[PDB]
Amino acid sequence: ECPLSHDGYCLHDGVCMYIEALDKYACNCVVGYIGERCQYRDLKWWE
Amino acid sequence: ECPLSHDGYCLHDGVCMYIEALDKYACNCVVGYIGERCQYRDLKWWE
Amino acid sequence: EEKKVCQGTSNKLTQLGTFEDHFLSLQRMFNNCEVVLGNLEITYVQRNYDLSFLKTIQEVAGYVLIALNTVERIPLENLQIIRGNMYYENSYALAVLSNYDANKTGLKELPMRNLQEILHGAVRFSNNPALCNVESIQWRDIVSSDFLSNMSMDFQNHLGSCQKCDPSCPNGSCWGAGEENCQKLTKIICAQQCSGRCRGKSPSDCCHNQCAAGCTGPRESDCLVCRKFRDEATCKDTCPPLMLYNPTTYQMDVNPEGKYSFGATCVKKCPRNYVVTDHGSCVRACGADSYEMEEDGVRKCKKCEGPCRKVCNGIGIGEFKDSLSINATNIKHFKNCTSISGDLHILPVAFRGDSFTHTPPLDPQELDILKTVKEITGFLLIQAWPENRTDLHAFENLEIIRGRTKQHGQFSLAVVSLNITSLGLRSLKEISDGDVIISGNKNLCYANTINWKKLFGTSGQKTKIISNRGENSCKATGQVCHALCSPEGCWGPEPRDCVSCRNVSRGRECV
Amino acid sequence: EKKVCQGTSNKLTQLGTFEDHFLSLQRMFNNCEVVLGNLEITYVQRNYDLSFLKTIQEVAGYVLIALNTVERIPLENLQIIRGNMYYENSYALAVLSNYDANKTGLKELPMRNLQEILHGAVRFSNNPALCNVESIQWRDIVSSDFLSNMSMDFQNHLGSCQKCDPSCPNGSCWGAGEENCQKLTKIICAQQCSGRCRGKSPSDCCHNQCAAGCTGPRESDCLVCRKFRDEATCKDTCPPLMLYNPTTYQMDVNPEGKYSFGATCVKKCPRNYVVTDHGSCVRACGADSYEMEEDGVRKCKKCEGPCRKVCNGIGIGEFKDSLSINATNIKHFKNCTSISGDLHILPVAFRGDSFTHTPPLDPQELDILKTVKEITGFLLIQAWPENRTDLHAFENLEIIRGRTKQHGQFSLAVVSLNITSLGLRSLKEISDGDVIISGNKNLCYANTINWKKLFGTSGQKTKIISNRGENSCKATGQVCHALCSPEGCWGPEPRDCVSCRNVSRGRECV
Ligand SMILES: *[C@@H]1O[C@H](CO)[C@@H](O[C@@H]2O[C@H](CO)[C@@H](O)[C@H](O)[C@H]2NC(C)=O)[C@H](O)[C@H]1NC(C)=O
Ligand SMILES: *[C@@H]1O[C@H](CO)[C@@H](O)[C@H](O)[C@H]1NC(C)=O
Ligand SMILES: *[C@@H]1O[C@H](CO)[C@@H](O)[C@H](O)[C@H]1NC(C)=O
Ligand SMILES: *[C@@H]1O[C@H](CO)[C@@H](O)[C@H](O)[C@H]1NC(C)=O
Ligand SMILES: *[C@@H]1O[C@H](CO)[C@@H](O)[C@H](O)[C@H]1NC(C)=O
Ligand SMILES: *[C@@H]1O[C@H](CO)[C@@H](O)[C@H](O)[C@H]1NC(C)=O
Ligand SMILES: *[C@@H]1O[C@H](CO)[C@@H](O)[C@H](O)[C@H]1NC(C)=O
Ligand SMILES: *[C@@H]1O[C@H](CO)[C@@H](O)[C@H](O)[C@H]1NC(C)=O
Ligand SMILES: *[C@@H]1O[C@H](CO)[C@@H](O)[C@H](O)[C@H]1NC(C)=O
């Protein structure tokens, strides 16, 4: 759904998605990672 | 009229004097000198 | 007085896991929170989730994002002020967006009947069917002149239906029905000439110049929420100078009621790790033209001659506010630093290059550059490291991590998920504040023997060092040090990686 | 700007004849509006005219009115008495024994506008004929923390003065007509009010930073600033040149920050004062800290470990009571190049004062002052050894800052000296204040120094009159024209020259 550009937008195997409703692109980060691009591991939780 | 004490008190020829009215001493400084003890010469004026 | 505080998420419109996992976080994050240090983003909450726990939020420094929620009612009934120390889409202190169901029904009731002050930024309401009554609040009072000129927000009628507002409402204003749940003006119903806000819907018995929202009384002690500095029970513009001038003697005297300035609060002494300026305020860094020769146990400084002994910013600040990892593009700016005046994010993407930020993969050899860093005034985070190398070398001479700033506001040292055989920070002697977390490091031993209870000094410093190699599973690889070193563990195998030495020794190594 | 006068500070003493004493009291307060120092009215007779005191709007120190036979004292426009100093200790206002042998003295004292007495207590005693004042409830004029220590007992006599217009509140009244009623604004204020009020209502009270009263309820609508005066407003503290940044935990540049100079907040520091980094104009750098100016301005950093000396200077600290450098504590001037204050070489030092118990000074101890390079305040010399013809001890005196001046005018004053010449061949700057050299019988050369260069501040004049003579000294001395260029000379000797010729030198001008 996200353009070739945003291809690589989301790190840690997160998937980029297009918020048609708000015309934007966000990340559906895998559980455990936070931040707009899922850059940080959620240290204050597990492992 | 001033105690052997207050002798010298009023510098620059000022004359010492008892203010019986308030039980206190003070000086009748010569014309041209200011200060509780005529210690200073009223610069701003002349000579 | 003292309120419970939370960092506040800050990854707008991004979804953390599944609608549920996302939820669990939002809950885990704001549960019991009364003040939100950073941001308050409520997004993706669903049809029948319980956001009751938000009734504890009294204030949010940054902004409030509420977009993409199917939930029907949001309990932010107790939010009082939104400082706006940050914005959404620029110039937005409160951004409520696209809260609809595929069925055209999502957010309906927003009980923000206490949101009375929004110090900075503009508010945006757009595409949120079902939203009721909110379209009645006159923000000329909630917002401040300087922005209600850039605040876009129109409300649209929906298919559903909602009751009106009790005839006790002002000029209509009402965040819902409840009881007198009508927007209560305290900025406009004020008299011709009054400092700032007022509680008197007309009387000249209005609020103190230093108060946002309102005030139970007219004094400086009786106020809903302080606008700037909170000194004990009072609201201050600036805090009691340690030294007051003396108009009579044209000289300076000391001030008994003088306090130090920490954040927005006004302390009696600065936290053992912050820099205390002769002025009397706690800061996180001394000028570009200074040192940090801590003296009477308290860190202080004196100006040098122009540019001083290298003061690099460190990822995430000023010239790096946008970068999220030390990398080729601009690692160059760490050539001869002995002190990083910020944090250090060594991330995975750095080594593989982000084609989104247009940055070439970092040359492993370049990390040698950092081999000159002696201290990090903030936090050191490392979620990556070169493959064919088993030792955090670039940081062999790091001796101090001040923790003036920490990860998630909690961690000052974080070595997680590496393949390194050992740490190797054999020079580290201080972790001023923050917690240490070292985990997920498959084959990393020695760590479980650091006696950190010495390496750092501040009440509360914990050490979540889990799921690594295996003690009763590493003694086999002879990977230990217990014999030549001492009780205070080791940073590696060699005799130079000891924390403490048995029988004083030389050569930065022991034997 | 309000006209300000120094204000006599020589309590109970009398300056010459009852008239001479008047004339002075007149010359000082004629036109004043703000008395920076003290307001002392004493020994003014039965028919003199003290109408000029009608302009005094506020006195910084204390107001002493005693031993007067005049009947009416027009301090109608006095508004506030700071109380920076006290009389007899614990008194900002003291009206004492104002009667004539016939028990007939001060009668009316129209202080209808006096509303505030910031620091100190009031005292009235032995003032027959004083009218109305007997009715003034000061509980409003004075501050609670002082009434406990303020004595005032009014009395009666074989006379009488008219009652008080019923328009006056609790009977209180300073005078008769002109609604001389006590305009009270403190005990008459809504329970919950900043400080003083201009009205009874809880919506009629003043700013928590004002004195007497206010026209409006803001900071710009005040009768008299309680502490600092920021342009046209009243401030407690003045705009810092730096404001802390809560969010960044760092310091940001001055909002509308101003420097502090007295009770006024200036945009810049008088060039001859020290500017601290804090943003204040101080007369002296504390601790063991230098005073090295850099930005053209006199900032002042500290000097590694035990720095150097700090010679306070007559009139301050260890010498607030010492009125002239003398043998007793001249020792405290042994080795220092900067007098951090003033210097009074008064005749009493040389002759010994039998009242303070101090032995006459040894003229061979002024060589102690041979090491002084600069003087922050002013240099006053009214005496000087006879068997000497040159101000020697001050040979190396290079600069006088004038941060403080005699009477609040002169930074350099050498009068009544038998010296043939000054002898200040090092002096190169007189920051501010006027210089006066007179009453120096055989003093010459002086009339040629062209001081317009020697000092740097607007309006610095120089009263050098009645010394020796230009046409009379020409004989046995005077002129130096030759070795000393058209600039002038601090003496005849080549060294005394002000400017040599063609770079020529070798300490002198050969
Ligand atoms: C060596 O460390 C690297 C870190 O760069 C590990 O790489 C994994 O890479 C995959 C895909 O690129 C990620 O999904 C993992 O998160 C990375 N590992 C972790 C948990 O950090 C790699 O696992 C390690 N190699 C070994 C010894 O297995
Ligand atoms: C906060 O969330 C936790 C999550 O398990 C929940 O158990 C708790 O009831 C919530 N509120 C409290 C009591 O902190
Ligand atoms: C709204 O105004 C602010 C200034 O207050 C400005 O910074 C912001 O970019 C503006 N919004 C836009 C993008 O028009
Ligand atoms: C009510 O509020 C509206 C919008 O601010 C304003 O136009 C109107 O005049 C107010 N009614 C009055 C005058 O009380
Ligand atoms: C690192 O990469 C970022 C990616 O945006 C780049 O902008 C930054 O300048 C680079 N500098 C660093 C952190 O070495
Ligand atoms: C830092 O590197 C520079 C450039 O090579 C060098 O001149 C300097 O000596 C190094 N650090 C110091 C101050 O020793
Ligand atoms: C007193 O005031 C009058 C009028 O301004 C003036 O002429 C006179 O010189 C003043 N007294 C002196 C000499 O200061
Ligand atoms: C009276 O009170 C004043 C107020 O501070 C105090 O200084 C003084 O010592 C007290 N007693 C005297 C000396 O009258
Ligand atoms: C001068 O005499 C005073 C007392 O009148 C004494 O305190 C002081 O020490 C003397 N001045 C000097 C040179 O210190």
Q: CA–CA distance from D7 to each of D41, D54, D274, D418, D432 (Å)?
A: 11, 15, 26, 31, 20
Backbone angles phi, psi at C348, to 5 degrees: -55, -50
C274 touches chain D (CB under 8 A): yes
Please, which residues have CB within 8 angstroms of residue C66's CB and are 6 or more apart in sequence? C41, C42, C43, C74, C94, C95, C96, C97, C99, C107, C110
**SS3 of C476, please?**
coil
Q: Which chains touch A (3 or more CB pairs under 8 A)?
A: C
Check if C87 has its Cβ closer than 6 Å to any atom of ligand 3: no
To probe the interface with C, which of A22, A23, A42 has the most C CB atoms within 10 Å? Answer: A22
| Pairing relationship of beta strands D228-230 and D233-235 according to DSSP bridges | antiparallel
**SS3 of C21, please?**
helix
> What is the whole-number distance in angstroms between the Cα of residue D305 and the centre of ligand 6?
29
Task: Tell me the C-alpha distance between C57 and C32, whole Å.
Answer: 8
Alpha carbon D411 to its chain's center = 13
Amino acid code (one letter) for D427: L
Of the candidates A34, A39, A47, which has its C-beta nearest C324's C-beta?
A39
Of the candidates B6, B29, B39, which has its C-beta nearest D15's C-beta?
B29
The enclosing domain of B30 has a CATH number of 2.10.25.10
Amino acid code (one letter) for D3: K
Amino acid code (one letter) for D190: A
Task: Return the domain boundaries, chain C.
Answer: 1-185, 186-308, 309-499
Please, which residues have CB within 8 angstroms of residue A11's CB and are 6 or more apart in sequence? A33, A37, A38, A39, C347, C348, C349
Task: Tell me the C-alpha distance between C354 and D171, whole Å.
Answer: 87
Strand partners, C244: C253
Q: Please name which of D34, D91, D33, D88 lies closest in space to residue D62, comparing C-alpha atoms.
A: D91
Q: CA–CA distance from C433 to each of C312, C404, C413, D429 (Å)?
A: 21, 7, 10, 55
| Pairing relationship of beta strands D63-66 and D39-42 according to DSSP bridges | parallel
Q: Which two tokens stand for residue C107?
A: 């957010």
Residue B36's domain spans which residues? 1-47
> Nearest CA to CA, how far is C81 from chain A (Å)?
25
For residue D60, the chain C residue with the least C-alpha distance is C248
Task: Tell me the C-alpha distance between D86 and D105, whole Å.
Answer: 24
**Closest ligand (CA of C25):** 2
Four-residue CA torsion sign, D140, D144, D150, D153: positive
Other Cβ atoms less than 10 A from the Cβ of D432: the count is 22
Q: Which two tokens stand for residue D470?
A: 């230009």
Task: Tell me the C-alpha distance between A13 and A5, whole Å.
Answer: 16
Q: Whose CA is nearest to atom 22 of ligand 1?
A: C419
Backbone angles phi, psi at C25, to 5 degrees: -70, -60
Check if C148 has its Cβ closer than 6 Å to any atom of ligand 4: no
**Closest ligand (CA of D90):** 8
Rg of chain C taking only CA atoms, in angstroms = 27
> What is the whole-number distance in angstroms between the Cα of residue D200 and the centre of ligand 8?
32
Q: Which two tokens stand for residue C142?
A: 């909630």
Contact yes or no for D97 and B22 at CB 8 A = yes
Task: Tell me the C-alpha distance between D314 and D339, whole Å.
Answer: 9
Topology alike, domains D185-307 and D308-498: no
| Domain D1-184 homologous superfamily, CATH | Receptor L-domain (3.80.20.20)
Kindly tell me whether chain A and chain D come into contact, counting contact as 3+ Cβ pairs under 8 Å: no
Q: Which chains touch B (3 or more CB pairs under 8 A)?
A: D
Query: Any idea what DSSP says for residue C472?
Result: G
What is the distance in angstroms between the CA of the first residue and the CA of the last residue of chain C?
55
Looking at the structure of chain A, the number of domains it has is 1
Task: Tell me the C-alpha distance between D243 and D235, whole Å.
Answer: 16
Q: Which two tokens stand for residue D393?
A: 């001890």
Please, which residues have CB within 8 angstroms of residue D77's CB and are 6 or more apart in sequence? D54, D55, D56, D57, D113
Backbone angles phi, psi at C449, to 5 degrees: -135, 25
Q: CA–CA distance from A11 to each of A6, C14, C437, D257 (Å)?
A: 11, 12, 22, 48
Q: Which two tokens stand for residue D140?
A: 């409003």
Q: Which two tokens stand for residue C466?
A: 């889990």
Count the helix, strand and coil residues of chain A and give each as a percent rounded to the nearest 5: 5, 30, 60
Other Cβ atoms less than 10 A from the Cβ of C477: the count is 12
Q: Which two tokens stand for residue C376?
A: 């990090």
Task: Tell me the C-alpha distance between D195 and D185, whole Å.
Answer: 9
Q: Hey, what long-range contacts does C87-90 have (CB within 8 A, 24 or more apart)? A: C87/C63, C87/C121, C88/C12, C88/C63, C88/C124, C89/C124
Are the C-beta atoms of D229 and D258 separated by less than 8 Å?
A: no
Other Cβ atoms less than 10 A from the Cβ of C420: the count is 19
Rg of chain D taking only CA atoms, in angstroms = 27
B18 touches chain D (CB under 8 A): no
Q: Which two tokens stand for residue C121?
A: 């930024």
Find chain C residues with C-beta within 8 A of A44's C-beta: 407-408, 410-411
DSSP letters spanning C59-72: EESS-EEEES---S
**SS3 of C448, please?**
helix
- Residue ranges lining ligand 5, Cβ < 6 Å: C 315, 320, 322-323, 326-327, 329-331, 357, 359
| Domain D308-498 homologous superfamily, CATH | Receptor L-domain (3.80.20.20)
Please, which residues have CB within 8 angstroms of residue D281's CB and are 6 or more apart in sequence? C250, D259, D260, D261, D266, D269, D270, D273, D274, D275
Find chain C residues with C-beta within 8 A of D260's C-beta: 245, 247
Q: Which chains touch C (3 or more CB pairs under 8 A)?
A: A, D
Task: Tell me the C-alpha distance between D488 and D447, whole Å.
Answer: 9
Are the C-beta atoms of C376 and C400 separated by less than 8 Å?
A: yes
Find chain D residues with C-beta within 8 A of B13's C-beta: none
Residue from C89, C90, C119, C146 to probe ligand 3 pocket by mutation (most atoms less than 8 Å from CB): C90
Residue from C21, C30, C31, C57 to probe ligand 2 pocket by mutation (most atoms less than 8 Å from CB): C31
Task: Tell me the C-alpha distance between D168 and D171, whole Å.
Answer: 6
Task: Tell me the C-alpha distance between D207 and D225, whole Å.
Answer: 10
| Pairing relationship of beta strands D228-230 and D222-225 according to DSSP bridges | unpaired
User: Domain D185-307 is of which CATH architecture?
Assistant: Ribbon (2.10)
Q: How was this structure determined?
A: X-ray
Four-residue CA torsion sign, C483, C485, C487, C492: negative
Are the C-beta atoms of C243 and C207 separated by less than 8 Å?
A: no
Give residues after which chain B gaps, C-N over 2.5 angstroms.
Answer: none
DSSP letters spanning D155-185: ---S-------TTSTTS-BSSSSTT-B----
| Pairing relationship of beta strands C411-416 and C435-439 according to DSSP bridges | parallel
> What is the whole-number distance in angstroms between the Cα of residue D94 and the centre of ligand 8?
14
Strands (E), D61-120: 63-66, 80-81, 93-96, 116-117
Check if C202 has its Cβ closer than 6 Å to any atom of ligand 4: no
Q: CA–CA distance from D244 to each of C237, C387, C478, D253 (Å)?
A: 10, 45, 54, 9
**Which CATH number does C1-185 carry?**
3.80.20.20
- Residue ranges lining ligand 7, Cβ < 6 Å: D 26-27, 30
For residue D433, the chain B residue with the least C-alpha distance is B44
Other Cβ atoms less than 10 A from the Cβ of D89: the count is 9
DSSP letters spanning C493-507: SSTTSBSS-SS---T
Q: Please name which of C437, C484, C481, C482 lies closest in space to residue C456, comparing C-alpha atoms.
A: C437
Residues 375-434 of D with CB under 8 A from B: 380, 382, 406-407, 409-410, 413, 415-416
If you search the block for the tokens 């799921």, which residue do you land on? C467
Name the fold adopted by C309-499.
24 nucleotide stem-loop, u2 snrnp hairpin iv. U2 a'; Chain A (3.80.20)
If you search the block for the tokens 């580290």, which residue do you land on? C428
Indicate the helix (H) or strand (E) that contains D25: helix D20-29
Of the candidates A17, A22, A47, which has its C-beta nearest C98's C-beta?
A22
Strand partners, C290: C303
Strand partners, A25: A18
| Pairing relationship of beta strands D338-339 and D374-375 according to DSSP bridges | parallel
To probe the interface with C, which of A10, A34, A38, A42 has the most C CB atoms within 10 Å? Answer: A34
Indicate the helix (H) or strand (E) that contains D58: strand D58-59
Please, which residues have CB within 8 angstroms of residue D441's CB and are 6 or more apart in sequence? D418, D467, D468
Task: Tell me the C-alpha distance between C270 and C283, whole Å.
Answer: 9
Q: Please name which of C434, C370, C372, C377 lies closest in space to residue C400, comparing C-alpha atoms.
A: C377
DSSP letters spanning D432-501: SSEEEEE--TT--SGGG--GGGT--STT--EE--SSS-HHHHTTTS---BTTB-TT-BSSSSGGGBSS-S
Are the C-beta atoms of D73 and D105 separated by less than 8 Å?
A: no
Give burial (CB, 10 Å; 0-12/13-18/19+) of C395.
buried
- Please give the order of strands across the beta sheet that includes C375-376: C339-340, C375-376, C400-401
If you search the block for the tokens 């210089």, which residue do you land on? D435
Q: Does domain C186-308 have CATH number 2.40.30.10?
A: no
What is the distance in angstroms between the CA of the first residue and the CA of the last residue of chain D?
53
Of the candidates A12, A24, A31, which has its C-beta nearest C21's C-beta?
A31
Q: Which two tokens stand for residue D77?
A: 């426009």
Are the C-beta atoms of D211 and D196 separated by less than 8 Å?
A: yes
Contact yes or no for C261 and D244 at CB 8 A = yes
Residue from C91, C124, C148 to probe ligand 3 pocket by mutation (most atoms less than 8 Å from CB): C91
Of the candidates D203, D240, D276, which has its C-beta nearest C205's C-beta?
D203
DSSP letters spanning C72-124: SB--GGG--EE--SS-BTTTEEEEEE----TTS----B----S--B--SSEEE
Residues 389-428 of C with CB under 8 A from D: 404
Count of helix runs (H) and strand runs (E) in chain C: 3, 27
**SS3 of D80, please?**
strand
DSSP letters spanning D340-406: SSBEEE-HHHHH-BTTTTBPPP-GGGGGGGGG--EESS-EEES---SS--B--TTSS--EE--SS-B
Task: Tell me the C-alpha distance between D333 and C441, whole Å.
Answer: 72
Task: Tell me the C-alpha distance between C250 and D281, whole Å.
Answer: 7
